[PDB]
Structure 1
Amino acid sequence: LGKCNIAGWILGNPECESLSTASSWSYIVETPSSDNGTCYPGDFIDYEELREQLSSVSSFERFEIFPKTSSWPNHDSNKGVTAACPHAGAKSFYKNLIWLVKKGNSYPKLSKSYINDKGKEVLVLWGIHHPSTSADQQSLYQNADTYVFVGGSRYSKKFKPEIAIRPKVRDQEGRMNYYWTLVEPGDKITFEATGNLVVPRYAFAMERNAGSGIIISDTPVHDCNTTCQTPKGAINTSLPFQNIHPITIGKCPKYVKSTKLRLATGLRNIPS
């Protein structure tokens, strides 16, 4: 991910690359200075759980679950940009989400559904916006008392915006909370809102593996294979013990604090 962490990559932070082709990976590498993530301040719900679920995938295809040009005829899908997420000096937003605002002076009740016909699990992410002031609520959504509802065959949660002035983070006194769910094949996910909903635009069809992990390291990536990986580097050995790094991924020797494990095979050496 380089410049970005998993949050920025999976949301579409403007400073992050995007995967167009269907891809797969055996594990995930962040650098210790990967500090991009959620450029609009807030909480990413169950972030650590999502990172574990994404550590390794057999298949991964991004698709436009709610196409931008046709899904929101009665709402404005172009003004939802912010200076908290700049792109080339101009206001922007996450690539995978659309910050819907009122069209003119009307924000009608929103109702959009998707049925998973991809044959695999679909990762859907969305955000809830909590403005700083009642003025800010009405300037964006026109309605004062709003709710968001997201429902699936297994997920059901109702969101209520919480309006108050928070200390400025990236020049934002409001906050935005980020949510995710996995939609099983053949299931429907329903979105309903009278405001404050940061809708999905791109979702991810994926197949999870047996979980790998995440390595946070500055070590470069090369075209070597290996069967045991550490943040310092890869390990090619049949020996049962190693002292390079306790945190490893793969079929690895046990980690020990030993500096030397020399096993005698020959005789006591007594020349002359």
Structure 2
Amino acid sequence: SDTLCIGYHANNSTDTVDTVLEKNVTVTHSVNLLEDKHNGKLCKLRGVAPLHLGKCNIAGWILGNPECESLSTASSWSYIVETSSSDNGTCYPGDFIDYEELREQLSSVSSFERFEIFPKTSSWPNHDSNKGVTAACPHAGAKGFYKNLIWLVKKGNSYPKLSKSYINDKGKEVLVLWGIHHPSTTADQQSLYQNADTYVFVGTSRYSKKFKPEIAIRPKVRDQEGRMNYYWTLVEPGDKITFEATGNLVVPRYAFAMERNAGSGIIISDTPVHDCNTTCQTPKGAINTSLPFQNIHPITIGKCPKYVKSTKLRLATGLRNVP
């Protein structure tokens, strides 16, 4: 006699999922909710490439440490990348003031142009712009210095009051860095700048700081018992910046006219940089997902899945596989 039975699917599948009531339940079909694969590459975030410093850090890079000139500086970037051997920084020892804030502010720019605010040949007719070099910042075997700064020293036996202004006619803000030098001894002070007891003064519409050299022996670093502190400010469009000095000023040469973007970050890894787009970047590599969770890395840049500690988040679509 004739029959008609009611029933359900079963198959090949060995996909398991977990439920509140039961673990390791085998199901016909299932879909994964956790991204755990990355491409092993540092890619272009929202279509724009990162700045790759390689041999240097940001300090070395914006100051123009001699080892960083083989880099080429783009005119925009989405995030910055240093490597674990990015050890070329401030070759002359000292304090880089508000450095961490500086790195955050440069982390993304939409426009970046280096330019000679105070041209070497023309700006310093009463001081010596050619000496002012050190074994701490060696170039081609010979004593050198930062590219974007000049260490002004006395001419003959004379350091007359120095006075120099720059008006920002660039229509974007311009980042200006300078440095101040603290000699080891009064003999060194006088060797370089003639007058002991000097001052440096720097000012904009919103900034004003006076600096006095602090002459003493520090512990030797890269053979220096002296020290050099590096400072920086951002001159707004239309504003000007003015320098005044009776010695000890490491004056700017290059500056940078920039347009900041918006909180990006700096990634430190040896993962290689590639041509690829992504919307989510980790130091291990990039993530290409629409899935809401990931377990690759907690420190991401972009529109990222939420980092979780899970190893498996598998969602049943089909039904219990019973044969």
Larger radius of gyration: 2
Relative contact order, higher structure (CA 8 A, sep 6+) = 2
Structure 1 SS opposite 2:100? helix
Deviation of the 1:241 alpha carbon: 0.5
Confirm or deny: 8 A CA contact 1:149 1:157 kept in the other structure. Answer: yes
Quick one: which of 145, 158, 164 aligns to 2:210? Answer: 158
Q: 1:219 to 1:243 in 2, by over 3 A?
A: same
Counterpart of 1:4 in structure 2 is 56
Query: In the TM superposition, what whole-angstrom CA distance separates every residue of 1:112-136 from its partner, at most 9, and x where no partner exists?
Result: 0000000000000000000000000
Query: In the TM superposition, what whole-angstrom CA distance separates every residue of 1:159-181 from its partner, at most 9, and x where no partner exists?
Result: 00000000100000000000000
Cα distance in 1 between the residues matched to 2:277 and 2:294: 19
Cα distance in 2 between the residues matched to 1:21 and 1:270: 63
Confirm or deny: 8 A CA contact 1:42 1:176 kept in the other structure. Answer: yes
Deviation of the 1:19 alpha carbon: 6.8
Query: In the TM superposition, what whole-angstrom CA distance separates every residue of 1:17-55 from its partner, at most 9, and x where no partner exists?
Result: 367776100000000111110000000000000000000
Query: In the TM superposition, what whole-angstrom CA distance separates every residue of 1:202-261 from its partner, at most 9, and x where no partner exists?
Result: 000000001100000000001011110000000000000000000000000000011010
Confirm or deny: 8 A CA contact 1:4 1:35 kept in the other structure. Answer: yes
Confirm or deny: 8 A CA contact 1:153 1:187 kept in the other structure. Answer: yes
Q: 1:122 to 1:179 in 2, by over 3 A?
A: same
Structure 2 SS opposite 1:224? strand
Query: In the TM superposition, what whole-angstrom CA distance separates every residue of 1:78-109 from its partner, at most 9, and x where no partner exists?
Result: 00100000001100000000000001100000
- The number of aligned residues is 271
CA-based RMSD: 1.0
Confirm or deny: 8 A CA contact 1:22 1:62 kept in the other structure. Answer: no
Cα distance in 2 between the residues matched to 1:4 and 1:169: 18
Q: 1:174 to 1:47 in 2, by over 3 A?
A: same
Q: 1:174 to 1:21 in 2, by over 3 A?
A: closer
Counterpart of 1:134 in structure 2 is 186
Cα distance in 2 between the residues matched to 1:25 and 1:263: 39
Cα distance in 1 between the residues matched to 2:153 and 2:307: 54
Q: 1:18 to 1:124 in 2, by over 3 A?
A: farther
Structure 1 SS opposite 2:273? coil
Confirm or deny: 8 A CA contact 1:20 1:62 kept in the other structure. Answer: no
Cα distance in 2 between the residues matched to 1:165 and 1:21: 37
Counterpart of 1:246 in structure 2 is 298
Confirm or deny: 8 A CA contact 1:57 1:206 kept in the other structure. Answer: yes
Confirm or deny: 8 A CA contact 1:5 1:34 kept in the other structure. Answer: yes
Cα distance in 2 between the residues matched to 1:155 and 1:72: 24
Which structure 1 segments of 5+ residues have no match? none
Cα distance in 2 between the residues matched to 1:190 and 1:139: 26
Q: 1:149 to 1:63 in 2, by over 3 A?
A: same
Confirm or deny: 8 A CA contact 1:12 1:18 kept in the other structure. Answer: no
Cα distance in 2 between the residues matched to 1:189 and 1:248: 38
Confirm or deny: 8 A CA contact 1:226 1:236 kept in the other structure. Answer: yes
Confirm or deny: 8 A CA contact 1:105 1:142 kept in the other structure. Answer: yes
Identity of aligned residues (%): 98
Cα distance in 2 between the residues matched to 1:78 and 1:18: 22
Counterpart of 1:46 in structure 2 is 98
Cα distance in 1 between the residues matched to 2:69 and 2:81: 14
Q: 1:148 to 1:66 in 2, by over 3 A?
A: same
Cα distance in 1 between the residues matched to 2:256 and 2:300: 28
Structure 1 SS opposite 2:278? coil
Stretch moving more, 203-212 or 11-20: 11-20
Confirm or deny: 8 A CA contact 1:4 1:34 kept in the other structure. Answer: yes
Cα distance in 1 between the residues matched to 2:72 and 2:113: 8
TM-score with structure 2 setting the length? 0.83
Cα distance in 1 between the residues matched to 2:312 and 2:284: 19
Confirm or deny: 8 A CA contact 1:9 1:18 kept in the other structure. Answer: no
